[PDB]
């Protein structure tokens, strides 16, 4: 140590417990640097020294903006750590102190308070609800309550948007409805902002709020955000597409009416690039969404056809990783399940058979059932048309008959009963 910098925890507590403000500031500064250490900052040592309540008290000293700032930085870093470390900050009564600091005429201190609340709220549903209970929302939204958002600094706006998104995050329980209806209007504005990081965080907040029952989805959708979400869906920034796709994906799990609002916004025109995206997790999310779309009305399936998406689904089913192939299989089953005869004929024309049959070799009992259900559905359409023989031959030409024959000696019940049912009907003598 010695009369130098890069202090020991022992030297920090000495300076902080002093009656001299100058020395309390130096100690807090030393603590902030320490917690701003690149690798393994001694958070537990600082907590175990009982410094948190001292930091929180400093937040209250409007007489000294510097120590307010340094303490806010320190606590923010402690709050960033583990849940146990975040809890130590909460138990120190830091939340109401940060909220009081939001209205500070010192913007850089207000910003650091926004940051702190973000970390705390981000820990989980419990601490998120604590932040809301202390009445954090009103002050936060009051900071965004300006005629033009471009007047605020970019770092300032990004923090607010991020913290706000964490107040929308997590479930069991989800955020309170009244709090959501209070935040949404501001969320719509930030969705139409020009900054990509703001857009990203905004999209995440929407994806959270829509991750739930149909009631919560309607709250978001009736604010008319779907068109903008679809626009963000066609962005080039992956950090924007991912959350936007998640939001859209969530909305489509809802009712047919809500799904229609996604389709009316032109979402189906960008899905070709999503289903062929280089990132495999985008393909999975996009194929998953398509499966829920094809679980809808026949007129909605017809729009999937009209936008030329079937050949892309067949594509995913052929070359994607197994995880994404599973989602694709589901999309085909829902399609053949709800589709018209004509829609199913078109599906066969697009060459669905061979890619389906090839997945019967997979070591996954569930996808096998899904495919068998799809094949059965197609045969039903073939029955009405009086062309089961033509379909039988196709399956034989795609090497499908051998695979269905193998599933007769399968452990699962649904697999062997379904196989048997198909042979007796269409592949007997």
């Amino acid at each position: 140590n010695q009369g130098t910098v890069n202090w020991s925890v022992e030297d920090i507590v000495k300076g902080i417990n002093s009656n001299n403000l100058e020395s309390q500031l130096q100690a807090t500064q030393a603590a902030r640097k320490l917690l701003s250490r690149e690798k393994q900052p001694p958070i537990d040592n600082i907590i175990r020294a009982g410094l948190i309540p001292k930091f929180v008290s400093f937040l209250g000293k409007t007489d000294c903006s510097p120590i307010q700032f340094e303490s806010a930085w320190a606590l923010t870093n402690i709050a960033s750590g583990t849940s146990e470390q975040t809890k130590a900050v909460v138990d120190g009564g830091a939340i109401p102190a940060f909220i009081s600091l939001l209205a500070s005429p010192h913007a850089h201190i207000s910003e650091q308070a926004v940051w702190a609340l973000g970390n705390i709220a981000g820990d989980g549903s419990a601490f998120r609800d604590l932040v809301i209970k202390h009445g954090a929302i009103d002050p936060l939204l009051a900071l965004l309550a300006v005629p033009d958002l471009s007047t605020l600094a970019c770092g300032y706006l990004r923090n607010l948007t991020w913290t706000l998104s964490n107040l929308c995050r997590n479930k069991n329980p989800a955020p309170p409805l009244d709090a959501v209806e209070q935040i949404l209007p501001t969320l719509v504005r930030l969705l139409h902002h020009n900054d990509p990081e703001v857009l990203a965080d905004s999209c995440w907040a929407i994806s959270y709020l829509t991750d739930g029952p149909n009631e919560r989805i309607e709250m978001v959708v009736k604010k008319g955000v779907v068109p903008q979400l679809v626009k963000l869906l066609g962005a080039t920034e992956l950090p924007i597409v991912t959350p936007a796709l998640r939001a859209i994906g969530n909305i489509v799990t809802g009712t047919d009416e809500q799904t229609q609002k996604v389709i009316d916004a032109g979402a189906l025109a960008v899905f070709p690039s999503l289903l062929t995206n280089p990132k495999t997790n985008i393909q999975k999310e996009a194929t998953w969404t398509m499966s829920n779309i094809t679980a809808g009305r026949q007129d909605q399936i017809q729009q999937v056809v009209n936008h030329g998406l079937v050949p892309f689904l067949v594509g995913v089913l052929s070359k994607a990783d197994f995880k994404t192939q599973k989602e694709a299989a589901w999309a085909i089953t829902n399609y053949t399940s709800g589709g018209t005869v004509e829609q199913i004929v078109y599906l066969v024309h697009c060459g669905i058979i061979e890619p389906l049959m090839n997945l019967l070799s997979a070591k996954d009992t569930k996808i096998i059932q899904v495919i068998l259900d799809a094949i059965s559905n197609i045969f039903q359409a073939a029955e009405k048309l009086g062309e089961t023989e033509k379909l039988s031959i196709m399956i034989e030409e795609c090497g499908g008959l051998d695979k269905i024959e193998a599933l007769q000696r399968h452990e699962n019940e649904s697999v062997y009963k379904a196989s048997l049912n198909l042979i007796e009907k269409y592949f007997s003598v």
């Binding site: 709050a79 960033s80 750590g81 975040t86 940051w115 970390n119």
Partner: peptide, 12 residues
């Protein structure tokens, strides 16, 4: 994603 330590801006 959930939190960030400040210098900076990270995750802990």
């Amino acid at each position: 994603q959930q939190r960030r330590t400040r210098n900076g801006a990270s995750k802990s």
